[PDB]
Amino acid sequence: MAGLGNVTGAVASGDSLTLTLDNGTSASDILELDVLSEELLRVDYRPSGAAPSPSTPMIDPDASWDAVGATIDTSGDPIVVTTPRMRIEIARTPARMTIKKADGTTLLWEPASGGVFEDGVRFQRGSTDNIYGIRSFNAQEDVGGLLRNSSDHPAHAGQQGDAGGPFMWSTAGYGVLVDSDGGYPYTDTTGKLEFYYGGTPTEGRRYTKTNVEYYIMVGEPKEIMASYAQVTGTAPMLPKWSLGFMNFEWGIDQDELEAHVDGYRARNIPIDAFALDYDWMDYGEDNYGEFRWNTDNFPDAATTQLKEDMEAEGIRLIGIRKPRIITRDFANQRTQQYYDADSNGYFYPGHNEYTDYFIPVTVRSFDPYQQASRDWWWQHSIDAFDKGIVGWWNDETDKVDSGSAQYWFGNFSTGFTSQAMYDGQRDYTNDGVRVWQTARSYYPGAQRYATTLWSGDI
Amino acid sequence: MAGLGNVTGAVASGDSLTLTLDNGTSASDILELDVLSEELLRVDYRPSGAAPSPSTPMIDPDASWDAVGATIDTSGDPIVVTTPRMRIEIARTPARMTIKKADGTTLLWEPASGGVFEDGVRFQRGSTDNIYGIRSFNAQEDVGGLLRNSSDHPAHAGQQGDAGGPFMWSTAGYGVLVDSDGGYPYTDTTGKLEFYYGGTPTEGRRYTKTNVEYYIMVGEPKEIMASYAQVTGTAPMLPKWSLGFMNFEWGIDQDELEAHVDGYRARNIPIDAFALDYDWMDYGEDNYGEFRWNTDNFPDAATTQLKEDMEAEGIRLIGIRKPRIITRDFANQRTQQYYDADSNGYFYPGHNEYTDYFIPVTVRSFDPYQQASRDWWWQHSIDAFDKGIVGWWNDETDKVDSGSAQYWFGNFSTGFTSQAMYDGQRDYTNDGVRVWQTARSYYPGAQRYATTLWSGDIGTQFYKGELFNWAPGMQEQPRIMLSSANLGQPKWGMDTGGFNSLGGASGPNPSPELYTRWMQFGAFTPVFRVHGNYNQQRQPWLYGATAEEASKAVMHTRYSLLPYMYAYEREASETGLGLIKPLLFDYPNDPQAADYTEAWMFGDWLLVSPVLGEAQHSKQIYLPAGTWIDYHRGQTYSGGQTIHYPVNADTWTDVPLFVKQGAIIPNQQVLDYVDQQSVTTVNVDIFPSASETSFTYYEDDGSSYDYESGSSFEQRLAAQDLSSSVRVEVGAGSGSYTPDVQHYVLKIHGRAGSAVTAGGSALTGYGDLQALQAASGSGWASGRDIYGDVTYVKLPAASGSATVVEVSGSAPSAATHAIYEVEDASRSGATPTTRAGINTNHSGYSGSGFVDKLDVPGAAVTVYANAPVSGDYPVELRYANGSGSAKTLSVYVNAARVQQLSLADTGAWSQWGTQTTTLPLTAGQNIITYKYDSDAGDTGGVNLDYIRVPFAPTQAEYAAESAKLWGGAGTSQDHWFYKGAAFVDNLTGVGAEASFDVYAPSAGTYNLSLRYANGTGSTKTLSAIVNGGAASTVTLTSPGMNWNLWNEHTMTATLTAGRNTISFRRNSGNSGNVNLDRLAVSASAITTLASERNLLDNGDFERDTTYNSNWTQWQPSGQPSAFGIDSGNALHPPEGPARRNQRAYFHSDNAYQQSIHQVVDVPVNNATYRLEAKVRMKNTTPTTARAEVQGHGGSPIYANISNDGVWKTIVIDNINVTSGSVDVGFYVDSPGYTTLHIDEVTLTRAP
Ligand SMILES: OC[C@H]1O[C@H](OC[C@H]2O[C@H](OC[C@H]3O[C@H](OC[C@H]4O[C@H](OC[C@H]5O[C@@H](O)[C@H](O)[C@@H](O)[C@@H]5O)[C@H](O)[C@@H](O)[C@@H]4O)[C@H](O)[C@@H](O)[C@@H]3O)[C@H](O)[C@@H](O)[C@@H]2O)[C@H](O)[C@@H](O)[C@@H]1O
Ligand SMILES: OC[C@H]1O[C@H](OC[C@H]2O[C@H](OC[C@H]3O[C@H](O)[C@H](O)[C@@H](O)[C@@H]3O)[C@H](O)[C@@H](O)[C@@H]2O)[C@H](O)[C@@H](O)[C@@H]1O
Ligand SMILES: OC[C@H]1O[C@H](O[C@H]2[C@H](O)[C@@H](O)[C@@H](O)O[C@@H]2CO)[C@H](O)[C@@H](O)[C@@H]1O
Ligand SMILES: OC[C@H]1O[C@@H](O)[C@H](O)[C@@H](O)[C@@H]1O
Ligand SMILES: OC[C@H]1O[C@@H](O)[C@H](O)[C@@H](O)[C@@H]1O
Ligand SMILES: OC[C@H]1O[C@H](O)[C@H](O)[C@@H](O)[C@@H]1O
Ligand SMILES: [Ca+2]
Ligand SMILES: [Ca+2]
Ligand SMILES: [Ca+2]
Ligand SMILES: [Mg+2]
Ligand SMILES: [Mg+2]
Ligand SMILES: [Mg+2]
Ligand SMILES: [Mg+2]
Ligand SMILES: [Mg+2]
Ligand SMILES: [Mg+2]
Ligand SMILES: [Mg+2]
Ligand SMILES: [Mg+2]
Ligand SMILES: [Mg+2]
Ligand SMILES: [Mg+2]
Ligand SMILES: [Mg+2]
Ligand SMILES: [Mg+2]
Ligand SMILES: [Mg+2]
Ligand SMILES: [Mg+2]
Ligand SMILES: [Mg+2]
Ligand SMILES: [Mg+2]
Ligand SMILES: [Mg+2]
Ligand code: NI
Ligand code: NI
Ligand code: NI
Helix, strand or coil, rough: CCCCEEECCCCCCCCCEEEECCCCCCEEEEEEEEEECCCEEEEEHHHHHHCCCCCCCCCCCCCCCCCCCCEEECCCCEEEEEEECCEEEEEEECCEEEEEECCCCCCEECCCCCCCCCCCEEEEEECCCCEEEEEECCCCCCCCCCCCCCCCCCCCCCCCCCCCEEEEECCEEEEEEECCCEEEEEEECCEEEEECCCCCCCCCCCCCCCCCCEEEEEEEHHHHHHHHHHHHHHCCCCCHHHHHHHHECCCCCCCHHHHHHHHHHHHHCEEEEEEEEEEHHHCCCCHHHHHCCCCCCHHHCCCCHHHHHHHHHEEEEEEECCCCEEECCCCCCCCHHHHHHHHHHCEECCCEEEEEEEECCEEECCCCCHHHHHHHHCCHHHHHCCCEEEEECCCCCCCEECCEEECCCCCHHHHHHHHHHHHHHHHHHCCCCCEEEECEEECHHHHHHCCCCCCCCC | CCCCCEEEEEEEEECCEEEEEECCCCCEEEEEEEEEECCCCEEEEHHHCCCCCCCCCCCCCCCCCCCCCCCCCCCCCCEEEEECCCEEEEEECCEEEEEEECCCEEEEEEECCCCCCCEEEEECCCCCEEEEEEEECCCCCCCCCCCCCCCCCCCCCCCCCCCEEEEEEEEECEEEEECCCCCCCECCCCEEEEEEECCCCEEEEEEEECCCEEEECCCCCHHHHHHHHHHCCCCCCCCHHHCCCCECCCCCCHHHHHHHHHHHHHCCCCCCCCECCHHCCCCCCCCCHHHHHHCCCCHHHHHHHHCCCCCCCEEEEEEEEEEEEEEEEECCCHHHHHHCCCCCCCCCCCCCCEEEEECEEEEECCCCCCCHHHHHHEEEECHHHCEEEEEEEEEECCEEEEEEEECCCCCCCHHHHHHHHHHHHHHHCCCCCCCCCCCEEECCCHHHHEEEEECCCCCCCCCCCCCCCCCCCCCHHHHHHHHHHCCCCEEEECEEEEEECCCHHHCCCCCHHHHHHHHHCCCCCCCCEEECCCCCCCHHHHHHHHHHHHHHHHHHHHHCCCCHHHHHHHHHHHHCCCEECCCCHHHHCCHHHHCCCCCEEEEEEECCCCCCCCCEEEEEEEEECEEEEEEECCCCCECEEEEEEECCCCCCCCEEEEEECCCCEEECCCCCCCCCCCCCCCEEEEECCCCCCCEEEEECCCCHHHHCCCCCCEEEEEEEEEEEEEEECCCEEEECCCCCCCCEEEEEEECCCCCEEECEEECCCCCHHHHHHCCCCCEEEEEEEECCCEEEEEEEEECCCEEEEEEECCCCCCCCCCEEEECCEEEEECCCCCCEEEEEECCCCCCCCEEECCCCCCCCCEEEEEECEEEEEEEEEECCCCCCCCEEEEEECCEEEEEEEECCCCCCCEEEEEEEEEEECCCCCEEEEEECEEEEHCCCCCEEEEEEEEEECCCEEEEEEHCCCEEEEEEEECCCCCCCCEEECCCCCCHHHCEEEEECCEEEEEEEEEEEEEECCCCCEEEEEEECCCCCCECCCCCCCCCCCCCEEEEEEECCCCCEEEEEECCCCCCCCEEEEEEEECCCCCCCCCCHHCCCCCCCCCCCCCCCCCCCCCCCCCCCCEEEEEECCCCCCCCCCCCCCEEEEEEECCCEEEEEEEEEECCCCEEEEEEEECCCCCCCCCCCEEEEECCCCCCCCCCCCCCCCCCEEEEEEEEEEEEEEEEEEEEEEECCCCCCEEEEHHHHHHH
């Protein structure tokens, strides 16, 4: 957790400056500065001069910049790097960076206490500076503001609409971007602006870095953002239809889709796309069913016909994808896609197969406390009894746990459910067929209605 | 919490002892002891001697004991009950029970501090006694032992194998059983043995007891247990086969069952039964599927064959039962079982519909991090792509939660999943088809692979905690969007309408209000999309006519802006900056922009601030440095301030949108979809600033990556306001793509030139925009629009050289009206091939044509017309009618049917006429529709040429509820007969005020009329302050002690040109205590406003249902009301209102009669009135269903309502009122299930 030592060597060449820093050993630390643009500096700290690790997929591998022709003056203390847009000062003893505008305004700096080190970057800046980036908010979180002035939330992709990254910037005229697979940005109102690799995040870490590769941006917000896009990549242009209105829908087939499109077109309500949920594909089936059009829902997707008729009406189709495959189909048989993925090693590391559900059913609890309800429940069971159900396995007379639904049945629910079958069967068979039942709860009195108890999902 | 008082009486009789206990009062406590057996005592404590409540189902209702012949000695202290097995002592002062064995050993006793009491029993016993009972353990719990020596666990049935009850006993020789529905047993190692009813337990309580009924057992454990069974019941004998082995199984059919049984039998492994899980029944299906044998799994269960064949092999069958029914079948239809349960009330109380799953599959996550894995993933996607999947909605690349499965995907999973599709599609199509994707996470770098971000499973609610706390709602979304933009992912969207509700998929859709506001918001975000949960619908027409029309209108604005928006899509490919940004991007040094999210930039030149509040009448909007022009209303605002912005809560037509001075905004005709046709004229709206600004117009093929190697087109447009001219440069064309655009029409706002020059040549002047558009070759024209003076300049696009245009001079138009050629407007109809049409097959039309095909029911044309202020606008319709007689069309304004127009024959189809109708327009955008509404009795059958809308109304109105309220002034709906969505009240404290922003075309004296209520009984006062001038007194008389009466206060005011402030305030000397509704303003004498014609209170049922109205209801004595008011958003699909948010309904599952009625005193007696309403009926044909008018001085007038399922208009005209009042009503006589919806009821004075 210590800062860099003294500078023992400074080699300038073009837009690059390489500093050798004393660390007490024969393997000195290396710090490589590269002026990428007039307002963008790449810093690569290599502890004990070890080779850098590969950059994570944050970094655009095709990124390149024109020569800047920065001035690099190693003649004194501090060493000075200048462009028309920024002035970088590296003090020699110990090595500490200060970043300034070309006009001399101090933006951020590595404090005496310590700056870059083997596990992150540490800067100090104006305590009233407004900080942005780092994180957003997901569909299960309290939603804060834009400001990140007292932030310790990790840098992650997150889930459920979240966004994040090791990118922290200010309207005071600077940004910091660290190449990293997750990690821990930190800010506070004393002026700290830091980033730590830390321990393995919740989401895992598959790209480890021995070096610390980071970028310093100078400029107004749009300039910072443009520099961010130079480092991590610009966005390819989407199809122009993607500026139009889109109707996403779960629970839809071809006839419904046609009626919806007709409803929009009849009303001159513009629309360019429908997105189809599970409905579009044979999810759950063998032979890559989770990639295949569901022709029960969409008969004309047996060929290019659906595509072409929808295109003729100005509708493009989007389809939902899940990054998983069905490994046992509806009939519990191993699928072709399982064998192919298993033999080639295509499953996500640490993720084992799991039983899952995707076909929702709507239900609602009956009330066994009412005689008329019990009479009804029994009446509708007679046919099943006649055709061989002679024992009643009464499950879930205790509590529902389904999504937002946490509903308790009352203490007499087992007794009364049991009573419905007991009274009914005894009446129907004129006391000629003994009743047998089981339930997974018991309260005094339930035993009058011929029920056993089983110990649940052990 | 105190113990019993002194025994004051003791009556022994047989095996019973009845004690009377002192409690201070004349109604003494009763304690009944009954010796049931030699070792079983019943105790019944009845506070104040009240009758006991019924015993819970714990108690065997048939329990019965032989006489014991116990000895009861009341002669001393203690009283003594003995049997051969126990000795019960009751001390007299205070009453305390001690229980002993016959031999005198003390088992337990009530301590001095208190025993039995109103909410339980309290005993003391040996501290080393071992206690048993109370509770067991479930399949999700740590499992303890048998001892209950330090227990505070509740007595409950519990879940998942639990057992429990108010039964505590000891091997030291005693037991205690309390009759109770749940409760709280307590033991500790000091010797306490207690039971409390307590509050309602987690599981609920449906059996409440005012008495305390309990039982004391004496004996060894088997004797205690036998006594327990005497009280609560013995167990009937199970079938003998139930002592055998049973194989329970889930995932089984008849073939497998037979194989299993053969397996047992072949090996002589005994077995008596198989239990069948979901497999046995048609769970999920209609017609009681959850009670019916599944004959796909078990074919021989079609008859008794399966039962009989299995019985022959010695196998009995057990079937799983769930205490619930399926309420929706696999095609989302209500089930028979639902209808039966719902109508009879058989659902568990407090348990609503919810989502279950019963069909499992097994899945496993793929690794997108590997190139070989990505190749495989793409290869298997090709067939779906060929057959129409051209966009990839990549879900759950973040985290999965499935049981024990809590698996995280790594930070690069969205990027790499996107790369699989991106690299793949680009290779397969040879860079010929652009990639589109969306994911629900973002991490830096993912943007390289062409993916947007959506905000995940957000809640269908206005804000987090409105309806539920576990997901954010609409109001949080701008903060999520702008946080994403701050991370370099500006390509963002949300589930407009929301995804999650209480109850899951079966839970409610958004209200029409929530839906409409969300659509207006979404139209100004990058990825514009609706979504909802399983089997939910998000089509705009389902949410009523306001949602439909407001959504359509804002969608037209977005699509008109395609050329503007598309330049930002290109910009994102060069710098990553996109279509939206927070204000802080442009204003890094502004502290009021630092955390600002209620407004944002849409491109460089538009600031948008959608109305996101429920029932919001006004908005505070921060405008940063510059000059801003209201897009819809035309007025200018100086920057660097928070403005008060009135909005119309009644129409929902406002989307607050501000043009940044400097703006250069390319726009086009509205297409149904992006490449519906070539667009050859692009409009460029220019609002020049004193500094030069520019916008680079951009085209390419919209479809491929050809743009990457130069195949695109751009032209830099630049503008500057100079000392006495405006200069606009259209730079030379650039790039190799040949664009569709042939001409720009520059619309240069703020100057109506006398000359327009270019290259030492003065351009040819034309009479107006239409003449200019029809001319070949360049030219100019001038006019007036909502913003003021405008100069039009038509020039060729894509020239090889730059053109500099200069507009000089000032010659303002004399025009009094804007003209909208209806052939340029929005044409609709019942189906895609029956929309209103365009034609030129009769002569004499203005513009390029006229609108025909208004002769198929439902055909319509809709004009979007801006108004600077709310008020009366006489709108002229030009039409032809060569039919030989009058024809009718409906005119709708902001989704309200304003009038049926009677359009006279004009002599021939090539001869044209005009009809002028005063329309109630609101400030900003208005939706004006001419429609053949056959369900309102229109004929249709005319051709329409244009409408002319005056730039100024005849008189203006300003809603008090939308004014700037201060000093405690607030909005309310808690009195009747207000106009608009509300009124203003609480003008009580000194300083309370409502301040109106009133606009005037010129300096002068204007008439004001202030609508107010004063039900104090006496005259009250406020002060009027105009432009901060000297206060004048406003004296406001009272009609009497009645806050449902409104009056006009008329006055004059000197106003200046432009914006004026007119405040009504309780100054120090004023009394206040009046309610304010609306301020009318006119240069002429003020008359009845077009928006205020309706004489009914709450005729549209839009009032918050917490507050009542002048509507009354009736049903037969003893029948529940079948009437309510709501939005219809809880239904799937929604059955929405005719307009705005709410509609009345009549519905019952049983036979019913129901009416609503409203009586009003009319303004002018001995005159003619007219009743109009929207009505919709479905389900069973009722015997009677009608609108009714009565009490008017004539006999009742009826109009029948006809069972369709569609909204129709019912009209009762020519109501001759001579009584001074009218009763309007709606009545249904149904055999059951008939649903009537009623909305938009109006009673108006009829010409
Ligand atoms: O309205 C539909 C849903 O929408 C949102 O979720 C979107 C989500 O939908 C799909 O996944 C649904 C859920 O699937 C799994 O959990 C399902 C249940 O698993 C267990 O129970 C299984 C069965 O066990 C038997 O023994 C029992 O007899 C039977 O009744 C029971 O169903 C759990 O014990 C239950 O509690 C679960 O309900 C996942 O584990 C869940 O995370 C998931 O919500 C779809 O496949 C997904 O891709 C998609 O993301 C709402 O959030 C959701 O509540 C709602 O149902
Ligand atoms: O309804 C108003 C309408 O009246 C005239 O047009 C009538 C009619 O003219 C066209 O149809 C003519 C004719 O076509 C076929 O022969 C059918 O079999 C006939 O029933 C039909 O009458 C036109 O196609 C129709 O749209 C139209 O209703 C005026 O000429 C119209 O301008 C005016 O809108
Ligand atoms: O329970 C009040 C409810 O009644 C109506 O909804 C009916 C619907 O009209 C019927 O067609 C059928 O689907 O059953 C529903 C009863 O739940 C009203 O339309 C609705 O507003 C109201 O809430
Ligand atoms: O019906 C499927 C499963 O449902 C659970 O609630 C029961 O406890 C199990 O015994 C049963 O196999
Ligand atoms: O596939 C069903 C649902 O799954 C959820 O994980 C997604 O976030 C929803 O958008 C989708 O509708
Ligand atoms: O002004 C509103 C009031 O009007 C009538 O007096 C009603 O009886 C009352 O319930 C209501 O609150
Ligand atoms: Ca015309
Ligand atoms: Ca009002
Ligand atoms: Ca309404
Ligand atoms: Mg370089
Ligand atoms: Mg390290
Ligand atoms: Mg601060
Ligand atoms: Mg659907
Ligand atoms: Mg079709
Ligand atoms: Mg198939
Ligand atoms: Mg293997
Ligand atoms: Mg007796
Ligand atoms: Mg009580
Ligand atoms: Mg002990
Ligand atoms: Mg099996
Ligand atoms: Mg056999
Ligand atoms: Mg069947
Ligand atoms: Mg009902
Ligand atoms: Mg305000
Ligand atoms: Mg009041
Ligand atoms: Mg009255
Ligand atoms: Ni997060
Ligand atoms: Ni328990
Ligand atoms: Ni009903």
